[PDB]
Amino acid sequence: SAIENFQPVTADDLAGKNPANWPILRGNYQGWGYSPLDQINKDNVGDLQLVWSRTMEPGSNEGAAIAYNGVIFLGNTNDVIQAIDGKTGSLIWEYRRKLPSASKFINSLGAAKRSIALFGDKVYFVSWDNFVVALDAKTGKLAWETNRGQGVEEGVANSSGPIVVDGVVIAGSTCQFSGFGCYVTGTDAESGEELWRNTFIPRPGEEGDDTWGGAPYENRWMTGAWGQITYDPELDLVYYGSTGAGPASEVQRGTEGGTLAGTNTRFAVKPKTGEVVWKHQTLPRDNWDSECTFEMMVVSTSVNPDAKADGMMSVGANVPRGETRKVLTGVPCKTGVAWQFDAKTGDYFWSKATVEQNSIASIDDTGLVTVNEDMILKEPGKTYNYCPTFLGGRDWPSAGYLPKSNLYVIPLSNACYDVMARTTEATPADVYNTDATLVLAPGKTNMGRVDAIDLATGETKWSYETRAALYDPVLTTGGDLVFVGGIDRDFRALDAESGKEVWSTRLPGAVSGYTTSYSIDGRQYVAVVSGGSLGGPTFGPTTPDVDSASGANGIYVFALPE
Ligand SMILES: O=C(O)c1cc(C(=O)O)c2c(n1)C(=O)C(=O)c1cc(C(=O)O)[nH]c1-2
Ligand SMILES: [Ca+2]
Ligand SMILES: [Cl-]
Ligand SMILES: [Zn+2]
Ligand SMILES: [Zn+2]
Ligand SMILES: [Zn+2]
Ligand SMILES: [Zn+2]
């Protein structure tokens, strides 16, 4: 019935033109994480009730209810993909991939899945075994699949999910446990043919190779692009970011002094070809697993940064002050520094720290980052008191945009990392080859935090704090609300103007996944994926007074009483 008269998903849908739907991870191509739906607002949110819910597969539950014309498309863990009636919560179809023994996968991160993608009459995802897979949206039955290579025992996978642009499925990758780097690919959405593949680690003698400190090519590991991909239709530019290299210590890498061209770089590329239009390295010489791979938003804003705003690192030499620009903006790396660029040219406008950070000594008026020499992991076994941590700061949990107030709303953790490089030799299995203790940032008694930053001035308008880590995405809405989950298991709504909590419900486990909103027959629904991720186990022990249990993975859906 719900699936019956399925209409093909177009670029108009994916650009977020129909606010009744949420047909892409952040509601629109541009990465806003916003629903224009305004039925639910601060005056009635207190009445929100559970309408329906459904159990999801076990494991790290970071996915999103992709809603389209009354149907929820839902990536579970373990390559289980569901269509669910968005009104009743009844299963419509389920695809369950045949998996080899989990022990065969060296990269367990590929079990989690932040999104599927929609285009035409197909659902698109990347499997744990590193295939781009297309299912029939109407039935969940496989239409085609294409092996990208190096899956399973070789550890290339994907955790964020693809987007489809101009008939091209664009998907990044994680190779966290591999003795090599990885890539972003574009795949034809109808034929399944790989059209292009962009890599990051320079080959010997090629542009950037001299920034790797002499490290043999085969010793350059783990540089990937595992975060969220965004897109601007008008400019026709796809945006993604690459990550760092392992192990964390440049001494152990053999890259002393190396700024590591290709790593932690923000790329703007043409969707059909992968051609790089512009790029900017947001964290050079990474010794801190900084991963500048997180979603970056395309918004139009007046440009007027305050050099005295809290955390402001620097303002661009050629900042077009007072002018309105389409910008690429947000926090790309775990470090928690917000950046703003001209979306078309990559001209640097400004950058601004949020959480306590000590990896970046300065950023000059061109956007050139100089790292803090004191935090380079130069002596194995020495404890370096890094701020933030290998989980931020920010991490994958996405920001939201409030277009009425021009606020960028980002969930953050007030944590620092007492980290040391192990004294034993690093292998790819060892990842960053570090041991660490996580602590609250200096003078902070609240681990969970949400900052709302004015994109014109860089001023923080409000900041919400709570005892335990949030480590969960935000949803912003046209009802002037911000929804966010936490490891305290609360799913809460904040007043978008003040940051003050106006409603909450407590879910059975840490609220670990995305929140989306859609409507059916005029009724607004708010859907959250819950149960647990790496967040609770990591941040929970710092605030053991909070009951941060994981469990009961599911989608949980709320609405006002009929
Ligand atoms: O370097 C990589 O390839 C890679 C992949 C992943 C993943 O795909 O989830 C994470 C990280 N890195 C990472 O550094 C990190 O802190 C992290 C947290 C999470 C999560 O699910 O909470 N995934 C990942
Ligand atoms: Ca990583
Ligand atoms: Cl529609
Ligand atoms: Zn449509
Ligand atoms: Zn630049
Ligand atoms: Zn100011
Ligand atoms: Zn509450």
Given resolution (angstroms): 1.7
226 lines ligand 1 (CB under 6 A): yes
159 lines ligand 1 (CB under 6 A): yes
Q: In this structure, what token pair is assigned to residue 96?
A: 């369950």
Q: In this structure, what token pair is assigned to residue 177?
A: 């446990």
356 lines ligand 1 (CB under 6 A): no
Distance CA 111, CA 212 (A): 31
- 419's CB contacts (< 8 A; 6+ apart) are 248, 288, 377, 383, 384, 386, 390, 434, 435, 436
- 103's CB contacts (< 8 A; 6+ apart) are none
Q: How far is the CA of 459 from the CAs of 45, 82, 299, 309, 312, in angstroms?
A: 28, 42, 17, 5, 9
Distance CA 415, CA 419 (A): 12
Which ligand neighbours the alpha carbon of 392 most closely? 1
Domain count across the chain: 1
Distance CA 68, CA 520 (A): 10
Instruction: Please check whether residue 243 is in contact with residue 197, taking contact to mean a CB–CB distance below 8 angstroms.
Output: no
Distance CA 523, CA 117 (A): 24
537: part of which helix (H) or strand (E)? helix 535-539
538 lines ligand 1 (CB under 6 A): no
CA 249 to ligand 2 centroid distance, Å: 14
CA 34 to ligand 2 centroid distance, Å: 27
The runs of H, that is alpha helices, within 379-423 are: none
> Among 549, 553, 456, which residue's Cα sits nearest to residue 513?
553
Ligand 1 pocket test: pick from 126, 127, 159 the residue with the most ligand atoms within 8 Å of its Cβ: 159
Nearest ligand 1 atom, CA 182: 3
> Among 157, 86, 162, which residue's Cα sits nearest to residue 118?
162
CB neighbours (10 Å) of residue 101? Answer: 7
293 lines ligand 1 (CB under 6 A): no
CATH number of the domain where residue 232 is located = 2.140.10.10
14: part of which helix (H) or strand (E)? helix 11-14
Experimental method: X-ray
Query: 3-state SS of the chain: helix, strand, coil percent to 5?
Result: 5, 40, 55
472 lines ligand 1 (CB under 6 A): no
Distance CA 378, CA 249 (A): 7
Distance CA 336, CA 332 (A): 8
CA 257 to ligand 2 centroid distance, Å: 21
Give residue 290's domain range. Answer: 1-562
Which ligand neighbours the alpha carbon of 266 most closely? 5
Distance CA 182, CA 117 (A): 21
CA 36 to ligand 2 centroid distance, Å: 33
Q: DSSP of 236-257, one letter per residue?
A: TEEEEE----BSS-HHHHT-TT
